[PDB]
């Protein structure tokens, strides 16, 4: 089962900001930019599809959401050096920060993906308690936004991403996820 925290197809999104799209070599931004970048990572992503779907079922989170996060954080591993981000702080496909959590497992295995996803479900649970009035799908978006900037940065539904990296974290991840949803995740 994977619908415990909501469904990504029901989340409204404005996609990648131009700050995310331009460095990727696109001349346009928004949802189409997020989907094109997600398509570029699909071959690399498919290498971990079995593990991503397995962890999603295990934690009751959509495999599509895990894939969107992996695409944004590390381009499915293409941007990493032995699992490390370019500043040496982030580890693995989902980039768990070594200064905040001791990384577990190999950089591209089930243990790592389970750790990153558990960190995500903890943020979703925090937003659920912080905004009880929101719908489940709204809380899922808040949860994803907090994965980048912390629960303290989510003060409203409308402006949640301001303050995240490129001011578009959840919006961009949700769009990439909607793409993976249509392509096997």
Residue 78 structure tokens: 């293409």
Contact assessment for residue 20 and residue 33, using Cβ atoms and an 8 Å cutoff: yes
The total domain count for the chain is 1
3-state secondary structure string, 10-70? HCCCCCECHHHHHHHCCCCCHHHHHHHHHHHHHHHHHCCHHHHHHHHHHHCCCHHHHHHHH
Hey, which bits of 71-146 come out as E strands? Answer: 90-91, 96-97
Q: For residue 1, give its domain range.
A: 1-185
Question: Half-sphere exposure (CA, 13 Å, Cβ side) for 69?
Answer: 30
The catalytically annotated residue of 24, 39, 57, 73 is: 73
Based on the residue annotation, tell me whether 73 is a catalytic residue of this protein: yes
* CATH number of the domain within which 99 lies: 1.10.530.10
Query: Resolution, rounded to a tenth of an Å?
Result: 1.5
In angstroms, the Cα distances linking 12 to 24, 41, 104, 142 are: 23, 22, 33, 12
Residues 6 or more apart whose CB falls under 8 angstroms from that of 2 comprise 56, 57, 60, 61, 62, 63
Region of residue 140 (phi > 0: left; psi between -120 and 50: alpha; otherwise: beta)? alpha
What is d(CA 166, CA 145) in angstroms, rounded to the nearest whole number?
A: 12
Q: How far apart are the first and last CA of the chain?
A: 13
């Amino acid at each position: 089962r994977t619908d415990c925290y909501g469904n990504v197809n029901r989340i409204d999104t404005t996609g990648a900001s131009c700050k995310t799209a331009k460095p990727e070599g696109l001349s346009y931004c928004g949802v189409p930019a997020s989907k094109t970048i997600a398509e570029r990572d699909l071959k690399a992503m498919d290498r971990y599809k079995t593990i991503i779907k397995k962890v999603g079922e295990k934690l009751c989170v959509e495999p599509a959401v895990i894939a969107g996060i992996i695409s944004r954080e590390s381009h499915a591993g293409k941007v990493l050096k032995n699992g490390w981000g370019d500043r040496g702080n982030g580890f693995g496909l989902m980039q768990v920060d070594k200064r905040s959590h001791k990384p577990q497992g190999t950089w591209n295995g089930e243990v790592h993906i389970t750790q990153g996803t558990t960190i995500l479900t903890d943020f979703i649970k925090r937003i659920q308690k912080k905004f009880p009035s929101w719908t489940k799908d709204q809380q899922l978006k808040g949860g994803i936004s907090a994965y980048n900037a912390g629960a303290g940065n989510v003060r409203s539904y409308a402006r949640m991403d301001i303050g995240t990296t490129h001011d578009d974290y959840a919006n961009d991840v949700v769009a990439r996820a909607q793409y993976y949803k249509q392509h096997g995740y």
